[PDB]
């Protein structure tokens, strides 16, 4: 009953960041060590918890959040960050207990002429609360004239594509990101590390 992290990290397609995907992990045996010793990840930052100490702990639920952003925004997937991604797209809490994993995906997510499929939110009436997800497409009212569902002066469609292109510098190339957050409820813990087994050993 290994935890299905392969379905998250190796998913053939990744969500746009404004519509970031969440997978709930429960009732399985987690080995964060196979992730931590990988070397394919350019980013593996953990907040609060040590990644090796992670294999010795138990949680009620583990949430895997995945999306694509560009390289120089990966730094925004951290507590206390501001910027277009953290303010309008995916927001980590200041008390974040968990890990941010990222790697470069130019070879999958860029194409000549540009990849327009990946979108981010450029505007919003207010910053997102932590782990809030906004998937709406209302014309954004940048000025005092109401928009009433019509694009116009100071009336903007709020989602915009990166246009990822293979010759872009690395700070502009696409990065796949997995954020792991750990829930300890009052309930029983069902996600434990590999040294907890229910099978007899000889």
């Amino acid at each position, epitope marked *: 009953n290994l935890c299905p992290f392969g379905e998250v990290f190796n998913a053939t397609r990744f969500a746009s960041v404004y519509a970031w995907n969440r997978k709930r992990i429960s009732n399985c045996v987690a080995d964060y060590s196979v992730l931590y010793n990988s070397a394919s990840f350019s980013t593996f930052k953990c907040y609060g918890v040590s990644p090796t100490k992670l294999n010795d702990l138990c949680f009620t639920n583990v949430y895997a959040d995945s999306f694509v952003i560009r390289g120089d925004e990966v730094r925004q997937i951290a507590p206390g960050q501001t910027g277009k991604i953290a303010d309008y797209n995916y927001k980590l809490p200041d008390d974040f207990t968990g890990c941010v994993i990222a790697w470069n995906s130019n070879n999958l997510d860029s194409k000549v002429g540009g990849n327009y499929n990946y979108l981010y939110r450029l505007f919003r009436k207010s910053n997102l609360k932590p782990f809030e997800r906004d998937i709406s497409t209302e014309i954004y009212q*940048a000025g005092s004239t109401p928009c009433n569902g019509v694009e116009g002066f100071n009336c*903007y469609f*709020p989602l*915009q594509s990166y246009g990822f292109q293979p010759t872009n510098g690395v700070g502009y190339q696409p990065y796949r990101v997995v954020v792991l957050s750990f829930e300890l409820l009052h309930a029983p813990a069902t996600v434990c590390g590999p040294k907890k087994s229910a099978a007899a050993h000889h």
Partner: single-chain antibody
Amino acid sequence: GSEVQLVESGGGVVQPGRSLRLSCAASGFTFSYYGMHWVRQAPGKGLEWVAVIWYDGSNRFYADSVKGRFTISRDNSKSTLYLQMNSLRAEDTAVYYCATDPPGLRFRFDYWGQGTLVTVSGGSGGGGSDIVMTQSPLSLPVTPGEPASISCRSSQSLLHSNGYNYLDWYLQKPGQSPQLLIYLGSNRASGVPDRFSGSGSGTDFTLKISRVEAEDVGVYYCMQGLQTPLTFGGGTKVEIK
């Protein structure tokens, strides 16, 4: 909307092989939210897209005929767009327009400048994947007050899973710079009278004028904004009979 101003400079007469830098001073709107384009028109010819730069400078695309020789850049703190042209050739001779592109929904030229003239004294490209736009008819003599319709087919579907058709129509009145008429297949631009309407989907599109007025005379172009390079039709000349 009416107060948007784009003012190109830098044009002149230069020898082949020399360099020239175009400028476009923008006022009247938040320049740093818009992508910016250069579009050119050789004398007596249609419109040809040149280059685009993302609202924040992070991303640029070029037409193949200018790849490497031209560089597009911008200074958001001076609200100015630039075109650095190197190794000028005779075929580069044209009027160069800057145009704005609003956030989202891929490509659109919703405000145009005046042009600078640069004097150096419709194909699918080498690989065949560039979208070709074909318009019909070439000229359309019209009597005032009677309807008009013109058509545009594209070599590739402009319908996306979005449900959007990335097709626009642009009008160039005689002696004027082009202007947006219809965007995304069927939406009128601000101020376009309701006697204009665009229809169609996928690969076949039509523009209809319910009752042509003499101020509607010009050359109408279709254009796809689905992917780069951005490509225009050959244009349809609407004139009074």
